[PDB]
Amino acid sequence: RVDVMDVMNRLILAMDLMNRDDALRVTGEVREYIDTVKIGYPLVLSEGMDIIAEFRKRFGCRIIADFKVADIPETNEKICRATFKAGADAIIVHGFPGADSVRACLNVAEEMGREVFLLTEMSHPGAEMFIQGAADEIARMGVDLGVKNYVGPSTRPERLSRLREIIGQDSFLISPTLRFADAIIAGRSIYLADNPAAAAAGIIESI
Amino acid sequence: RVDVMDVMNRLILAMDLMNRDDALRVTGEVREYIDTVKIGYPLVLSEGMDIIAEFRKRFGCRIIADFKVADIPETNEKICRATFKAGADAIIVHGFPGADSVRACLNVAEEMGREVFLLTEMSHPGAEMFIQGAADEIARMGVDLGVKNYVGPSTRPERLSRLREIIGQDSFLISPTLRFADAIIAGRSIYLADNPAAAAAGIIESIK
Known part of the structure; x- marks a missing residue:
């Protein structure tokens, strides 16, 4: 689909390491294979939000901030603005x-020309209680709001088909299948x- | 209750400003009245997590990180560790x-000798859909986890009574009533x- 992001090789790196040296070393080594890196709070709280600009400048990758934003509207606005800035x-x-x-x-x-991904579900054990x-x-709420990008369950293929049914064939869906x-x-x-680098290469092959 | 935190004057400052200069200026001015400051992501993402230590070292206040942690267990562990560090x-x-x-x-x-507050509810309009x-x-789950500290609804007093019923009279409950x-x-x-400084003084007078 032309209007949603192109992720190189359909493979996103979840860069969940917490020290800047290790994180940078890995991401650079796989830049030939991956152009999209997902970073979360463990790295940014440990090293600073400046690390986002560093990944983009050193590797030219897209950055998805996995911040699982879950506050009231006014606070969500500020979190998004700081993150996009x-x-x-x-x-x-969320x-x-x-x-x-x-x-x-x-x-x-x-306002800023960026993207929101809606997290529709989670796959860790306690997710059964409420999520x-x-x-x-939640997925239907997204569709009704014109959300175009979704993060789905990590496990359960039949959950992906259900999500795909709700969001349609046009929307962008990523999962921790293809x-x-x-x-x-x-x-x-x-x-x-x-x-x-070899690991990434291997996953790409099976893709 | 001896085993839960003492908040000076029963009043917590929600320091939701995003620039370090403004934030520091307000908190220092009210340190006489407030010893407990709640900081969120708008400030820490804008200015760095180092601002937490700055608040504590400049004002000697307790800091509550309102990070609404809402990830998988392993990631939650790392967020908490970084925040407490x-x-x-x-x-x-959450x-x-x-x-x-x-x-x-x-x-x-x-492990680190710190505290977890469980957010049981939210009061913004969309909170009706699922929260x-x-x-x-969620409150009952907290009680069955030995959670001692809770953040309750901002609005609806009768919700506070229900929460207090579930969590008992011993647990610590904060709300945006007393x-x-x-x-x-x-x-x-x-x-x-x-x-x-005057604003804080005023609210405090209303609190007996």
Whole structure:
């Protein structure tokens, strides 16, 4: 789809290491394979938001800020603005806090020419308590708000088909499979590999 | 209660300004009245996590990191560790992601001698869609995790009574009322006031 992002090789690196030296070393080594890197709070709180601009300038990669934004609208707006000002191309936001909290993010994204990804579901054990039961309604809420980018369940293929049914064939879907998701996310498989470059190469082959 | 934190004058400052100069100026001016400051991502993402230690070293205040932690357990652990390493006394974490995600935070807080606050509910309009219906069960989940500190609804006093019922009379409850909550949180009423010091003084007088 022309109107959603192109992720090189359909493979996103989840750069979840917390020290800047290690994080930079891995990302540069895989830049030939991956052009899209997802960073979260462990790295940015440890090293500073300046690390976002550093990844973009050193590797020319797209950055998705996996900040799971989950506050009231006014605070969500400020979080998004700070994150986009730091150079993030996109931000991941929770749907559980409701439509006006998501819309606040959409507003800033439109102002600044950036992207919002709605997190529809999570796959860790405790996700059963509240998140799983809300997932379809959260996805529908996204569709109704014109959300174009979604983060889906890590496990359960049949969950991806259901999400794809709700969001349509045009929207962009990433999952931590490629029959339904546009790109997959790899973390440890790569950054804990002795040869991250080789690891990335291998995943790409099977893709 | 001896085992939960003492908040000076039962009044917490929500320091939601995003520039370090303005934030420091307001907090220092009210340190006589307030010893507990709540900081969120707008400030720390804009100015750096080092600002937490700066607040503590300049004002000797307790810092609560309102980070609404809402990730998987392993990531929650790392967020809490980074935040406590930066000097936060406490961190606010969402309950919606479930019990293991909360326990991960409790584990690090136990290791490091810090505190976890469970956010049981929110009061902004969209909170009706999913949060309001989960609030009592989230509170019960907290109690069944030995959670001692809770952040409750900003609005609706009768919600505070329900929460207090679930969590018991011993647990620590803060709210943005004092018949149920141990402390209240003031933000704009103070940091946007002509003189914050006077604003704080005023609210305090209303508190007996």
